[PDB]
Design a protein around this ligand. Structure first.
Ligand SMILES: NC1N[C@H](N)NC(=O)C1CCC[C@@H](c1ccc(C(=O)N[C@@H](CCC(=O)O)C(=O)O)cc1)C(O)(O)C(F)(F)F
Length: 200
């Protein structure tokens, strides 16, 4: 399968995906990396790996549908089968999500359905959980609410900051995201017609 990775920052998840798709017997290859923000480290990681990049600046579009179409054009240009959202920070419009239904994955740093949203760690610390984790899910219209592919629990330590908890959880993300991509790229895991996850 030909894979696009969308990013908005550092690209540590991207990196782990790059490394795993290049292990032998991989069912996936990353063919394009797209950022909605300029000068992010994720772009350097892509180019150092010999993978083409684009910056599609979301602030230059009148609305989300048009920004999403600019992304979609690049995905067509590159004959993309599967899209990975790896620290991508833009909510995607209805028709884009529908088009990519069953073919677009996201990494989220909590055990869904707890702590939906971009500040999951801040919420986890406020709430006082001793166990959090991360989740790979198919992307649905509803934010952080698509069908769950894989999850991994991660302990919260007494005295954790957003930074320390975030680093511990990234360690788990870098395991399950590549594993989930392989599962989908190989057709082992599919979004079924009944809207539910299917393992073959
Ligand atoms: N891109 C998606 N589109 C749709 N329709 N459904 C999804 O499930 C997507 C996956 C969302 C992934 C995450 C997520 C949740 C909320 C936002 C959000 O509020 N974005 C704002 C911009 C916020 C900002 O600049 O800080 C904005 O206005 O776009 C950004 C990302 C995530 O919480 O899981 C995390 F961890 F990635 F942040």
């Amino acid at each position: 399968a030909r894979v696009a990775v969308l990013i908005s920052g550092t690209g540590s998840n991207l990196q782990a995906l790059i490394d795993s798709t290049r292990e032998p017997n991989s069912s996936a290859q990353i063919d394009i990396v797209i950022s909605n923000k300029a000068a992010v480290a994720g772009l350097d990681k892509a180019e150092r790996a010999g993978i083409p990049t684009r910056v599609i600046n979301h602030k230059l579009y009148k609305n989300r549908v048009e920004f999403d179409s600019a992304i979609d054009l690049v995905l067509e240009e590159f004959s993309i089968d599967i899209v990975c959202l790896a620290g991508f920070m833009r909510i995607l419009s209805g028709p884009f999500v529908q088009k990519w239904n069953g073919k677009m994955l996201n990494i989220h740093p909590s055990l869904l359905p707890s702590f939906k949203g971009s500040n999951a760690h801040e919420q986890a610390l406020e709430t006082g959980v001793t166990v959090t984790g991360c989740t790979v899910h198919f992307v649905a219209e509803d934010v952080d609410a698509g069908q769950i592919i894989l999850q991994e629990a991660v302990p919260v330590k007494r005295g954790d900051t957003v930074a320390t908890l975030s680093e511990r959880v990234k360690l788990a993300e870098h395991k399950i995201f590549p594993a989930a991509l392989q599962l989908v790229a190989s057709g082992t895991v599919q979004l079924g017609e009944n809207g539910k996850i299917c393992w073959v």
